[PDB]
Amino acid sequence: GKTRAKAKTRSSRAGLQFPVGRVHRLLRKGNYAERVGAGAPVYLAAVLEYLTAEILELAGNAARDNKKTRIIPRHLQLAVRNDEELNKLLGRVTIAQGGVLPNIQSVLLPKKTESSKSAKSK
Amino acid sequence: SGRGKGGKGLGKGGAKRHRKVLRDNIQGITKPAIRRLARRGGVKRISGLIYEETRGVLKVFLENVIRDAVTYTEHAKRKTVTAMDVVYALKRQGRTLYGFGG
Amino acid sequence: KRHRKVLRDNIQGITKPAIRRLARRGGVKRISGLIYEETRGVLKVFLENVIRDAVTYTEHAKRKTVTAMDVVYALKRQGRTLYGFGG
Amino acid sequence: QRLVREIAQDFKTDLRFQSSAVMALQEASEAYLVALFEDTNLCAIHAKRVTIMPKDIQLARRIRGERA
Amino acid sequence: YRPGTVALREIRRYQKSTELLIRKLPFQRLVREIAQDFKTDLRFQSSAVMALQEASEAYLVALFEDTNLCAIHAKRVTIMPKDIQLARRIRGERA
Amino acid sequence: MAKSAPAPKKGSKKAVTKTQKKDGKKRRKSRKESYAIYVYKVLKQVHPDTGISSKAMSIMNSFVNDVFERIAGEASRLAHYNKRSTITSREIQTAVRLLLPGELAKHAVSEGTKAVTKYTSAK
DNA sequence: AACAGGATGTATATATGTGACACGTGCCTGGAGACTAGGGAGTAATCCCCTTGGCGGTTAAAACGCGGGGGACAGCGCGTAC
DNA sequence: TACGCGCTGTCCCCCGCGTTTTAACCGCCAAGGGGATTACTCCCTAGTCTCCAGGCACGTGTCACATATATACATCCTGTTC
């Protein structure tokens, strides 16, 4: 292809870096529909591309706050939990080694003096 | 390097293999194991009856998950669950797992 | 002519006896006065999630009449699947 | 009927409705609240009371979900 | 070191730290015990046991989180057997 | 190198270990399709000096696979609500709203609509 | 009115391995090319049914303030339970 | 072994519920229309068998590294008592 898509792949044509073509095979593999157009696989990658970048971007900020360079499963949970919109998308799931965000309740921490309210004697 | 027949299981048993009845093992989840889980939630104190109930809750949860994974296991005819039957069992029960598989 | 009736809502159509009657369907003998205000918020939150999906189904079908099938499709995703009004 | 029409209109305008669809919207919402009241009652007895309060309502939802 | 307030210190550490709280092999022999009744001589891989353990740990943590809010609802702090009954049934699990 | 298209060897790989110099062969391993390369690519874009851990990729590889399954699965269900036999960008444009709420739908649709728009109007 | 005590959380330089990448070869499979070919969709007329309101005629569900019973909130307290 | 904290006992005090007004609001009866959702007919541009070709990208050897994970020095903040 002198002017056709030999040089430019399907993913690069739409500006994406995700496989796109592998997704197109997945629709046929999963038998989601009898016929699949060209718009479907590229669109699915586009949702993944922004979701892939945004979650890593939010997690990447946690690594700097955590005094670490490489992203660990702890930061993946932190990025998801911090964003309330991400909670609706996912959060009824289990993340391997994700950890739990601090959720201390106000019923604990007896800020008032541990001595009795009436007098010093317990 | 095949050196015998296993069939149902316990290949080349004789007197070289070892096995135990394993009557009760839910007691392995003791006070420190339950307390650590409670600390993640934010619990201050835990009652005595909760420790046995926590074991009971774990027993029911494991029983529900395994029966789903066992069904997929016989379909593939494998004698062991590797990574996916647990994931598929967790997916169907609303406990979908990310990582360790898929 | 943007100016139209926008003040409070039709959620007040959920009357005080109706909220009590809904509680009477469950096992109650006394409900606080803030439940009536709470039911308005809870009903709106549940309705917004369900109706938004139903609107998407109507838009996808290029229709404008909300059919019973569009309603059950919205419900079955998040539970409370309404048996009936389908097929 | 007026309530459901405005909720849909708040996000997308020019929407039609059917009586059967309206009944479906009402039945699902009513049963959702009806099941909540029985679920909320179990919180009241745990607090040694029979009243239903937003404290009971918020707790009843939170354990079941619908708030995250 | 007051026992009530020291538990708060554990909460900060355990929530911050990421690790497997329950023992591995006691859980590994536990899941094997259940499998024998369901299917005799049913083998497990290393990955399967860890996946079951992590899912079980997260499930128990979520229950502890919910039961903790049941205690403050009853104007209490500690978890009683009544707390686990309310949390499980309201989720649609017990009944 | 001439043509090896006529294939009496499809499984191929190593069967008897009849080798000349380097040995270097095993049984044909099943192709485990993973998004590891592509996840790391966008990670460099948002934050170049971060890196990644192996356990993080395992979680994220499952996340991408499951998210696609949910989007494609919901689109398939929507493809049965109406009698359309073909799924295009519109079928998923409506599918994003049901699962991705709030700003996630806006970001997904805007990126998706731009991607399909720039997918065409080229070449 | 405020200091002591022992361990946990800090900096700062200090060791290691496993996790990671880079070569160098090797070989299908996944994309790409380029027409012939039959079947789901764009696009025109047809046709009845669906929703919007006239348009009155009783009737069962709201809307609201007062009354007297009682149940949730809250105070302390001695002994049980973690 | 010890005190933090269930549980009992008790009535502030603040309401959920019962009993009456109160007639306006929900509601169904007998018919039309304008707009919109399926049958019926025509023609059209992607993917889809032909029927071949070459490049990416996945393993198997071969070398050779970089940050995570905890250690030696050195030194402060927090929590819980007297």
Author numbering:
A (entry chain Ae): 2966 to 3087
B (entry chain a7): 2282 to 2383
C (entry chain 4): 2310 to 2396
D (entry chain g): 2205 to 2272
E (entry chain s): 2072 to 2166
F (entry chain U): 1838 to 1960
Question: What did the original publication write about this model?
Answer:
Nucleosomes are connected by a segment of linker DNA to form 10-nm “beads-on-a-string” nucleosomal arrays, which are further organized into a more condensed 30-nm chromatin fiber by the linker histones H1/H5.7,8 Using the newly developed 3C (chromosome conformation capture)-based technique and high-resolution microscopic methods, the higher-order spatial organization of chromatin in the nucleus has been explored at unprecedented resolution, revealing that chromatin fibers are further configured into chromatin loops, topologically associating domains (TADs), and chromatin compartments in the nucleus. Linker histones H1/H5 have been shown to play a fundamental role in chromatin compaction through different mechanisms. Abundant in higher eukaryotic cells, variant linker histone isoforms were found to adopt a tripartite structure, composed of a structured central globular domain (GD) (~80 residues) flanked by a short N-terminal domain (NTD) (20–35 residues) and a long C-terminal domain (CTD) (~100 residues). The GD plays an important role in the binding and locating of linker histones in the nucleosome, and the CTD is believed to be a major determinant of chromatin folding.
In this study, we determined the 3D cryo-EM structure of the H5-bound dodecanucleosome reconstituted with 12× 177 bp_601 DNA, core histones (H2A, H2B, H3, and H4), and linker histone H5 (termed as the H5-chromatin fiber thereafter) at 3.6 Å resolution. Similar to our previous structures of the H1.4-chromatin fiber, the overall 3D architecture of the H5-chromatin fiber comprises 3 tetranucleosomal structural units twisted against each other, forming a two-start left-handed double-helical structure with a zig-zag configuration. Indeed, our cryo-EM structure reveals that upon binding to the entry/exit linker DNA, the linker histone H5 in each nucleosome of the H5-chromatin fiber adopts almost the same configuration with an obvious α-helix structure in its NTD which we term as αN, and three α-helices in its CTD which we term as αC1, αC2 and αC3, respectively. The three α-helices in H5-CTD are organized into an HMG box-like motif and tightly interact with one of the entry/exit linker DNA. In each chromatosome, the histone H5 directly interacts with both the dyad and the entry/exit linker DNA through a three-contact mode with its NTD, GD, and CTD, respectively. Specifically, the H5-GD contacts the nucleosomal DNA in an asymmetrical off-dyad manner, while the H5-NTD binds to one of the entry/exit linker DNA and the H5-CTD binds to the other linker DNA. The L3 loop in the β-hairpin of the on-dyad binding GH5NCP is bent and folded back toward itself, whereas this loop is extended and binds the dyad-DNA in the off-dyad binding H5-GDchromatin.
